[PDB]
Enzyme design. Structure first.
Site, mmCIF file in Angstrom:
data_model
loop_
_atom_site.group_PDB
_atom_site.id
_atom_site.type_symbol
_atom_site.label_atom_id
_atom_site.label_comp_id
_atom_site.label_asym_id
_atom_site.label_seq_id
_atom_site.Cartn_x
_atom_site.Cartn_y
_atom_site.Cartn_z
ATOM 1 N N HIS A 1 -23.851 -12.227 87.336
ATOM 2 C CA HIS A 1 -24.719 -12.161 88.486
ATOM 3 C C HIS A 1 -24.519 -10.999 89.346
ATOM 4 O O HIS A 1 -23.160 -10.211 89.195
ATOM 5 C CB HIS A 1 -24.172 -13.572 89.170
ATOM 6 C CG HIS A 1 -22.914 -13.654 89.824
ATOM 7 N ND1 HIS A 1 -22.991 -13.941 91.358
ATOM 8 C CD2 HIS A 1 -21.768 -13.087 89.759
ATOM 9 C CE1 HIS A 1 -21.496 -13.990 91.640
ATOM 10 N NE2 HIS A 1 -20.861 -13.504 90.737
ATOM 11 N N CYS B 1 -19.203 -9.612 94.579
ATOM 12 C CA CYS B 1 -18.091 -10.446 94.182
ATOM 13 C C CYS B 1 -17.153 -9.805 93.223
ATOM 14 O O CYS B 1 -17.361 -8.559 92.669
ATOM 15 C CB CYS B 1 -18.974 -11.477 92.955
ATOM 16 S SG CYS B 1 -18.071 -12.802 92.011
ATOM 17 N N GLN C 1 -21.057 -23.424 92.064
ATOM 18 C CA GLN C 1 -21.832 -24.066 93.377
ATOM 19 C C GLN C 1 -23.180 -24.512 92.580
ATOM 20 O O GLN C 1 -23.934 -23.888 91.782
ATOM 21 C CB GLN C 1 -22.262 -23.182 94.178
ATOM 22 C CG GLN C 1 -20.669 -22.402 94.672
ATOM 23 C CD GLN C 1 -20.882 -21.942 96.045
ATOM 24 O OE1 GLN C 1 -20.930 -20.587 96.217
ATOM 25 N NE2 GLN C 1 -20.982 -22.623 97.015
ATOM 26 N N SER D 1 -21.943 -18.757 98.990
ATOM 27 C CA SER D 1 -21.238 -17.316 98.997
ATOM 28 C C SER D 1 -22.610 -16.181 99.643
ATOM 29 O O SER D 1 -21.938 -15.206 100.048
ATOM 30 C CB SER D 1 -21.059 -17.054 97.507
ATOM 31 O OG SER D 1 -20.295 -17.998 97.092
ATOM 32 N N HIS E 1 -27.746 -14.297 95.237
ATOM 33 C CA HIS E 1 -27.414 -14.093 93.860
ATOM 34 C C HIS E 1 -28.786 -13.532 93.032
ATOM 35 O O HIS E 1 -29.817 -14.182 93.140
ATOM 36 C CB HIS E 1 -26.771 -15.240 93.242
ATOM 37 C CG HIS E 1 -25.697 -15.697 93.766
ATOM 38 N ND1 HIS E 1 -24.172 -15.687 93.541
ATOM 39 C CD2 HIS E 1 -25.651 -16.744 94.582
ATOM 40 C CE1 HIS E 1 -23.554 -16.365 94.196
ATOM 41 N NE2 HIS E 1 -24.287 -17.010 95.125
#
Length: 147
Positions: free
Chosen positions: A43, A97, A115, A138, A141
């Site tokens: 990702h 990330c 998630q 977060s 993505h």
């Protein structure tokens, strides 16, 4: 009719049919091709000010808005689909990330680990397919299913 998540839509600019997946936010002109215990994905995450932790290896204090983060995500998707850039290269350079150092790879995972919107998109992707923007706590993505 179509594989899970996929629906037919109408292009506003061209008037041609296309296909949209409401689980992955992927869209494409051509009819989609077509569940495992595990999938493997990479990702690219773009964080923003409402992210759970507005911090990353790229920026101690992340300040960009959610709308700005989506614009960056849309631009990365454009470069990937046109072939000007590869997914893994953009992930290594720009993902907020820690997995950026591994070209975005997260490894293999089962349902009940990531998630929920990330997990649902991952399991709806086919091997080799990439998502559109996927929203979690977060940030935003882009997901590439590799296995």
């Amino acid at each position: 009719k179509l594989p899970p998540g996929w629906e037919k839509a109408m292009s506003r600019s061209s008037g041609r049919v296309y296909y949209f997946n409401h689980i992955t936010n992927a869209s494409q002109w051509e009819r989609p091709s077509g569940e495992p215990a595990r999938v493997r994905c990479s990702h690219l995450l773009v964080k923003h000010s409402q992210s759970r932790r507005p911090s990353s290896w790229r920026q101690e204090k992340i300040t960009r808005t959610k709308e700005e983060a989506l614009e960056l995500i849309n631009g990365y998707i454009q470069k990937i689909k046109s072939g000007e850039e590869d997914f893994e290269s953009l992930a290594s350079q720009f993902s907020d990330c820690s997995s950026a150092k591994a070209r975005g790879d997260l490894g293999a995972f089962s349902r009940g680990q990531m998630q929920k919107p990330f997990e649902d998109a991952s399991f709806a992707l086919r091997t080799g397919e990439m998502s559109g923007p996927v929203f979690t706590d977060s940030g935003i993505h882009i997901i590439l299913r590799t296995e």
